[PDB]
Design a protein around this ligand. Structure first.
Ligand SMILES: COc1ccc(Cl)cc1C(=O)NCCc1ccc(S(=O)(=O)NC(=O)NC2CCCCC2)cc1
Ligand SMILES: Nc1ncnc2c1ncn2[C@@H]1O[C@H](COP(=O)(O)OP(=O)(O)OP(O)(O)=S)[C@@H](O)[C@H]1O
Ligand SMILES: Nc1ncnc2c1ncn2[C@@H]1O[C@H](COP(=O)(O)OP(=O)(O)OP(O)(O)=S)[C@@H](O)[C@H]1O
Lengths: 272, 538, 325, 325
């Protein structure tokens, strides 16, 4: 999916809240790293002034977090409102032959789900994605600032992740939809057996229908199983790389930051 | 003659690494045959890998090349033994196995000589562990020749490679791969690479093994239900499921607890490294690497085994309640909707609860180890901090409940809106023939405002959840560090203490959220199984 | 669509579910004599280096163990004179193994254990040298390359010869060296359903090559068009000329066998013609021409083709018309 | 009961009362190139050690006899410099024989007898090296292992094709490497009594393999069921379908010959089917399947078989019914 759908989604919010969200997130993550950066200097030993500065940073963090959360909430609600109203208005002014041409399922279905789905899950998932990506960038910057040379070692591995990204999505999407399909005729089948139960017990066709249901539940399980297998694959490989990076970081920190740099407040942040 | 015995140990690794290369190069230039002790062999080989890392650590501490070469040679020898065993699993032979057995015997002899010469006078423990591992691998090889045909009488009476997972086109081969790939999912490389190019479909997908079908799980479940009902209910069906799904679930749970232990262990070696440099650290770094990879691998294997047990259970109880649908009476509209909800929400609740079952056993040990570990690093002050984080777990649950309530209300409004739409999108020509459409759009917008009003409270609760999520990590460190140094004992807080506390705070925040969802899922699953029992027994 | 055997002569059908009982490696040297040159050279150098390093290690150890390795003047004579370190020991191993025999370091008559290690070193060296020569020579009788030099025309045409439908295909040689007693096995494959309800996915049937009184084989000097006549008895006789170009799935393969002169091995070549490759009603251009005092063959017109006004109809219907005319 | 040739392809009939005139050893190297690998390696090391010890003894003796063996300073130069005991003499023998040439002990120009012993030592060494390489190479052209990789289905079925009784058996290849010009010789054996009162204990008769216009040979890429049609002229045509399973003693063997590509040798494979192995009225399952862009062959169904409703009767009675229908 291109950046155009998200661009329209966020431009429906307006310029008023876009920056209010983005800069607030950036500042919250900067505070969350700076508190530990100052704790690093706190460690080695004006302890009272140090602790007071730590308290100030701790307060800034929570205030900024509350602000960001309220921003995401308000923006998501406004976007849902405007999108629903615009959809209704644009559907109102359509010609009759358009309504006769398009089936009712598609026109009704967007309002039935798309609207519901967005309201239920887009704000929370967007917030989680933003927090995750900014926390990852912050952690990379931390382990770079701690050990400079470690930076130059981490850009190779990250490029590896790029290749792990593509091959994942182009399958993870696919399997996903397959699951949905194997869920749809199964349930429906159940209902068909319940209503015409007398006819089916009369024809003595119970065996063939049980065969059909075993077939359907197998087709459901193979999909819901390959999906979890692929998720495990991506998980394990990304984790192996996430362990390679900490190995290399610690191996560079023990030598560079002790033998030559002789600075102890560094290795703490990097390892953590 | 220490160097003499070191060389005598170096020799057999060299012998094996030299015989492996012709065969490995011929093999490098679709029936899987498994042998008894395969999984034991791979487990022991990983233990050998670990002990060899320790030997390399000893050799670094001592340094004299010839004194630490034996470890570097046994490393390649064990990797080449793995390569041999892969080449034998792919194509069976009676001779390659003897080729392994010779090397095992000679390595055992050399290790015995080392042990004797040491007894006559850290090294002791490592050498002993290697001796025990090589001996157990020798016994495995003796078992393998005892089984089929190392030399034994004429014909192997060989198995006839398993057709369950290897006969006619199947694509999901989980039970039929090398016990390393059973952990690291290496068999998915081919699938995912082919999937990148050609779009996947049911013709491009496999078929489920005989180990997991509707028939297999239904058979096991009905056998357990039979053995329990012949001794005659909700508790009955529960115990039946328990005894029917048995070993897999507890295996997943113990994988999970061992992973939790190693995860609690990581930050302590971090602490040790931080201490050492401020005042024996490369060893701790490589140990941290090994422990991270092993902990996460075990965690993932645990997840997968639990998920597969859950999928089995879903298939089983689904085909069972369909078998019950055949014998029910006609006197029992509302029952049809209740039946199809009994398959669409109740069964999914059951299966997701079976997903989260091992987490419910592994959470308490995790929080207990966390609190006891942080107490011994920060002292009494730690306890105070250990309260705050824990206090987030019940509160979270409360928040969740509120969400649910809100959800219900919202859903109601939503449903009504849909009704007021279904008319407009059907009387289209009627509607536009006199342009009464705006009059109905006003009513539709009137419903929408009520829907919007509900959503505000829901998103407020979501905001409170996200806020607490990152507020409690900050508050723990705040009220702990300020309450430790400038409050209680003015103890000098070395960087190690603070950073280990930070690590443990994150490693404890991650599991805490899951306990709330686990409790909700468990109570909902209990209610759904009561419902399933009430239905299945009418 | 899927092809049976590729144009280059390699086989297309990929095998699945082979119950490997190990015979794939049990053919130890008839396996690796199949390999390419880089792999075979790699595994030969690895054989040699493996053996050399093995015995260099054992010699290092024996000189260490006798104590001759401990540098000392008098009260001893080393089992191998002038040995100091591992490097010189590996130099001794390669000096005695590959039979250069430098003689700067002398093995002496004081230690019979060194005599034993030498008397096994040399025999194993000689045996592995013997096999690593025989197998490379058994390789240099790879004459499949001579199966490469043969060529067939890209597409085959059918014509009307002697009042009967005929199919013509070209072959030819690309070197001076002849191929002895080459024979043609010409086969057709098709998914067939028997009158008994039996369906076969693929059905090889021999179509004869039509030479003098009989005979399966031919003589290759110049490009010779192979000449078969399809008759009512022939299996190909039923098809239609308009249904072959697009829809039908008919592979006609030819297998030419023959033993090359100088090596004496028996090579062959295999090629397929699909239903979309073959065409109808044409004639090749005459290649051979009476030049100055010889016969010149021009391979530019090898694949050239001219139009011929011949009737277009099905061989069954053509046989019915022959019954009518 | 007794089998003619075993399934593995080895011959069963044990020979008795062979008037050995010695040709069994007169084939000196074509005897031992048949042997296994351990025996041949044993006899090669024994050849080499035998020759080495022989010449080491003669050299020890010649150095003893010249008196150069008697340790003395001056008034002489040893025929072989620096020789002391038997051990160093055997070291000299292996130093000059296998052409390492260490040169610590020097043969000198004072004694022409040592020149003679060297000039015969080296030539005999070279001759025995030449034969012990040629014969091991002549061995590594053992391609019977390639006769191992071929496979036939365990039991053979008969069917009704084209209104006539037919027998179907499977074959197949197990590697990429082809087999050139494979031919089928299909034979039946039976204790037969002639109308002249002559009884034979075993009577081989050819049953034809039915291909296109003629031909004895086939082309092996994928598993090809071999297709013969028994007719009134065929020797197998007289039997009954209920008498074959238990009582009668009829071995039907097939011999497939062909030359492998890379070595060029001509190998073959032999298998038997007994009266209790063969069965009646069935059909094999189609192996080849159109996969993604190729032909996939599944060897799991290789030996699989399905029931077919075909009439069960004797081929003689079936021919009489064909005369009636
Ligand atoms: C969020 O992680 C965790 C972190 C820590 C702990 Cl102590 C437990 C869990 C956890 O989750 N508890 C195990 C149970 C579980 C459920 C879902 C997932 S999953 O990864 O989200 N999903 C899949 O794998 N496959 C899905 C399954 C449903 C059908 C469609 C495919 C993974 C595992
Ligand atoms: N029992 C036997 N085993 C192997 N070879 C034999 C045997 N008997 C004879 N031969 C050889 O094969 C040929 C068979 O001819 P025979 O049956 O021996 O008749 P023959 O006239 O008696 O010839 P002889 O025995 O040499 S005087 C002879 O030329 C023998 O050289
Ligand atoms: N999938 C396979 N791939 C390669 N070779 C096979 C395969 N299956 C069998 N063979 C061998 O080729 C012959 C074919 O006979 P089969 O189809 O296996 O009948 P069979 O009675 O089951 O014999 P078996 O499997 O050895 S008990 C057997 O003798 C096997 O040795």
């Amino acid at each position: 999916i291109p950046w155009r759908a998200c661009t329209k989604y966020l431009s429906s919010a307006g310029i008023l809240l876009l920056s209010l969200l983005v800069f607030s997130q950036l500042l919250k993550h900067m505070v969350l790293v700076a508190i530990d950066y100052w704790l690093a200097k706190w460690t080695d030993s004006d302890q009272s002034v140090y602790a007071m500065v730590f308290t100030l940073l701790c307060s800034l963090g929570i205030v900024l977090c509350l602000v960001t959360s309220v921003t995401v909430e308000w923006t998501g609600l406004k976007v849902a409102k405007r999108l629903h109203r615009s959809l209704l208005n644009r559907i109102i002014l359509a010609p009759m032959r358009f309504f006769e041409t398009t089936p009712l399922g598609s026109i009704l279905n967007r309002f039935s789900s798309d609207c519901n789905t967005i309201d239920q899950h887009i704000p929370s998932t967007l917030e989680c994605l933003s927090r995750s990506t900014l926390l990852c960038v912050s952690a990379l910057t931390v382990i770079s600032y701690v050990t400079p040379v470690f930076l130059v070692a981490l850009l190779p591995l990250a490029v590896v992740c790029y290749f792990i990204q593509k091959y994942f999505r182009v399958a993870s999407r696919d399997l996903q939809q397959l699951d949905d399909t194997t869920q749809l005729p199964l349930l429906s089948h159940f209902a068909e057996t319940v209503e015409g139960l007398t006819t089916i017990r009369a024809f003595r066709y119970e065996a063939r229908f049980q065969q059909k249901l075993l077939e359907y539940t197998d087709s459901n399980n193979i999909a819901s199983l390959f999906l979890t297998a692929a998720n495990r694959w991506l998980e394990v490989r990304m984790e192996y790389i996430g362990a390679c990076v900490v190995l290399i970081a610690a191996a560079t920190s023990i030598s560079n930051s002790l033998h030559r740099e002789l600075s102890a407040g560094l290795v703490g942040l990097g390892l953590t | 003659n220490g160097c003499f015995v070191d060389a005598l140990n170096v020799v057999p690794h060299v012998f094996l690494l030299f015989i492996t290369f012709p065969i490995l190069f011929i093999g490098w230039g679709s029936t899987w045959l498994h042998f008894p002790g395969h999984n034991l062999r791979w487990i022991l080989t990983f233990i050998l890998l670990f002990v060899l890392v320790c030997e390399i650590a000893e050799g670094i501490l001592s340094d004299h090349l010839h004194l630490y070469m034996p470890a570097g040679m046994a490393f390649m020898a064990a990797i080449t033994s793995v390569v041999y065993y892969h080449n034998i699993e792919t194509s069976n032979f009676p001779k390659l196995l003897i080729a392994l057995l010779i090397y095992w015997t000679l390595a055992f002899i050399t290790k015995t000589i080392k042990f004797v010469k040491f007894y006559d006078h850290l090294r002791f423990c490592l050498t002993g562990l290697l001796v025990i591992l090589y001996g157990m691998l020798l016994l495995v090889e003796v078992n393998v020749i005892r089984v089929r045909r190392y030399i034994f009488f004429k014909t192997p009476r060989e198995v006839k490679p398993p057709e369950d997972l290897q006969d006619l086109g199947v694509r999901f081969l989980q039970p039929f791969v090398n016990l390393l790939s059973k952990g690291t999912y290496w068999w998915m490389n081919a699938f995912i690479k082919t999937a990148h190019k050609k779009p996947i479909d049911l013709r491009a997908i496999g078929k489920l093994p005989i180990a997991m079908r509707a028939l297999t799980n239904y058979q096991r479940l009905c056998v357990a239900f039979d053995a329990q009902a012949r001794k005659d209910g909700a508790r009955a069906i529960w115990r039946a499921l328990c005894h029917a799904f048995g070993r897999r679930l507890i295996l997943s749970s113990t994988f999970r607890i061992l992973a939790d232990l190693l995860g609690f262990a990581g930050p302590l070696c971090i602490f040790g490294i931080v201490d050492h440099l401020g005042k024996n650290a490369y060893v701790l770094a490589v140990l941290l690497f090994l422990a991270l990879l092993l902990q996460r691998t075990f965690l993932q294997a645990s997840y997968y085994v639990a998920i597969e047990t859950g999928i089995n259970l879903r298939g089983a109880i689904q085909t069972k309640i369909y078998n019950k649908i055949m014998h029910l009476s006609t006197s029992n509209e509302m029952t049809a909707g209740q039946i199809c909800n009994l398959v669409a929400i109740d069964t999914n609740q059951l299966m997701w609860f079976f997903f989260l079952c091992p987490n419910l056993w592994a959470m308490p040990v995790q929080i207990i180890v966390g609190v006891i570990l942080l107490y011994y690093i920060l002292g009494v002050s730690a306890l105070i901090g250990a309260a705050v984080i824990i206090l987030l777990a019940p509160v979270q649950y409360f928040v969740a409940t509120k969400l649910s309530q809100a959800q219900r209300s919202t859903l109601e409004h939503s449903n009504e809106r849909l009704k007021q739409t279904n008319e407009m999108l059907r009387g289209m020509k009627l509607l536009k023939l006199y342009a009464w459409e705006s009059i109905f759009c006003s009513r539709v917008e009137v419903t929408r405002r009520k829907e919007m009003t509900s959503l505000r409270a829901f998103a407020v609760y979501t905001s409170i959840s996200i806020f607490m999520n990152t507020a409690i990590p900050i508050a723990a460190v705040l009220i702990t560090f300020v309450g430790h140094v400038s409050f209680f004992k003015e103890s000098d807080l070395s960087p190690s203490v603070a950073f280990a506390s930070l690590s443990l705070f994150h490693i404890l925040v991650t599991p805490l959220f899951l306990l709330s969802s686990v409790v909700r899922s468990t109570v909902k699953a209990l209610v759904s199984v009561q419902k399933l029992s009430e239905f299945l027994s009418s | 669509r899927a092809r049976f055997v590729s144009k280059k002569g390699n086989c297309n059908v990929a095998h699945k579910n082979i119950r490997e009982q190990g015979r794939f490696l049990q053919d130890v040297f008839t396996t690796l004599v199949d390999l390419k040159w880089p792999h075979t050279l790699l595994i030969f150098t690895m054989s040699f280096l493996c053996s050399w390093l093995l015995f260099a290690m054992v010699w290092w150890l024996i000189a260490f163990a006798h104590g001759d390795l401990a540098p000392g003047e008098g009260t001893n004579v080393p089992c191998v004179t002038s040995i100091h370190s591992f490097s010189s020991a590996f130099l001794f191993s390669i000096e005695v193994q590959v039979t250069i025999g430098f003689g700067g370091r002398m093995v002496t008559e004081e230690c019979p254990l060194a005599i034993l290690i030498l008397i096994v070193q040399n025999i194993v060296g000689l045996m592995i040298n013997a096999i690593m020569l025989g197998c490379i020579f058994m390789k240099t009788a790879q004459a499949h390359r001579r199966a490469e030099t043969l060529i067939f025309s890209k597409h085959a045409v059918i014509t009307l010869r002697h009042g009967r439908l005929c199919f013509m295909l070209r072959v030819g040689d690309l070197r001076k060296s002849m191929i002895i007693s080459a024979t043609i096995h010409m086969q057709v494959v098709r998914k067939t359903t028997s009158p008994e309800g039996e369906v076969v996915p693929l059905h090889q049937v021999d179509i004869p090559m039509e030479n003098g009184v009989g005979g399966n084989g031919i003589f290759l000097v110049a490009p010779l068009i192979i000449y078969h006549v399809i008759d009512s008895n022939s299996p190909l006789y039923d098809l239609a000329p308009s249904d072959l170009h697009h829809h039908q799935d008919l592979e006609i393969i030819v297998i030419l066998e023959g033993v090359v002169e100088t090596t004496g091995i028996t090579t062959q070549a295999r090629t397929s013609y699909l239903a979309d490759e073959i065409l109808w009603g044409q004639r090749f251009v005459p290649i051979v021409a009476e030049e100055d005092g010889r016969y010149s063959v021009d391979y530019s017109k090898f694949g050239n083709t001219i139009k011929v006004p011949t009737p277009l109809c099905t061989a069954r219907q053509l046989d019915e018309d022959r019954s009518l005319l």
